[PDB]
């Protein structure tokens, strides 16, 4: 399935998946309509969510919460192929996303944050090795993009340790997560 914006697949997709049990047809309809409307007007889903939370008086920092929600698997980007390499790709992608999502819970404590950063580095190189291993075109381009976002995330870490703005780190981590999902989706659709 197509690559969509993070609010859609990280916030709404699980909601659609849960509505499956209630009524499959209605869930599929809502899902498809959401995808189409998001495609027509990018950022629609985020605005819908924000205005809904606003009207229900639910106060949150949406980028941080998005970072936490982005940990979950996106079923449509998961490779169904049984071969070990692809399942390993799913696993490494998942690991990186999971460790990146731990940032908001850890960033205030310097020690635990540094440990988290170490784990992030480890996950990144693991996913890199797996990606380069699977190579048996656009794939290489997505790999280079992934590396670029990794580097950018590191620079963001430096800048944070300079000025102390957490939001930039959250945004960068979200970017890296999205690029990971993009890697998997690209591998899946070729």
């Amino acid at each position: 399935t197509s690559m969509v914006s993070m609010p859609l697949y990280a916030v709404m997709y699980p909601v659609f998946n849960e509505l499956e049990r209630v009524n499959l047809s209605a869930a599929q309809t809502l899902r498809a309509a959401f995808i189409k409307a998001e495609k027509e007007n990018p950022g629609l889903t985020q605005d819908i969510i924000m205005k809904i939370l606003e009207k229900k008086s639910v106060e949150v920092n949406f980028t941080e919460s998005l970072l936490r929600m982005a940990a979950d698997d996106v079923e449509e980007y998961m490779i169904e192929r049984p071969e070990p390499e692809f399942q390993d790709l799913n696993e490494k992608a998942r690991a990186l996303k999971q460790i990146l999502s731990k940032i908001p819970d850890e960033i205030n404590d310097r020690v635990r944050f540094l440990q988290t950063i170490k784990d992030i580095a480890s996950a990144i190189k693991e996913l890199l090795d797996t990606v380069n291993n699977v190579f048996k075109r656009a794939l290489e381009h997505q790999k280079k993009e992934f590396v670029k976002y990794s580097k950018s995330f590191s620079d963001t870490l430096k800048t944070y340790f300079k000025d102390g703005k957490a939001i930039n780190v959250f945004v960068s981590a979200n970017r890296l997560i999205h690029q990971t999902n993009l890697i998997l989706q690209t591998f899946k659709t070729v």
Partner: peptide, 9 residues
């Protein structure tokens, strides 16, 4: 650029 690259495309 990052805002639209990972949404609109």
């Amino acid at each position: 650029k990052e805002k639209h690259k990972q949404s609109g495309g």
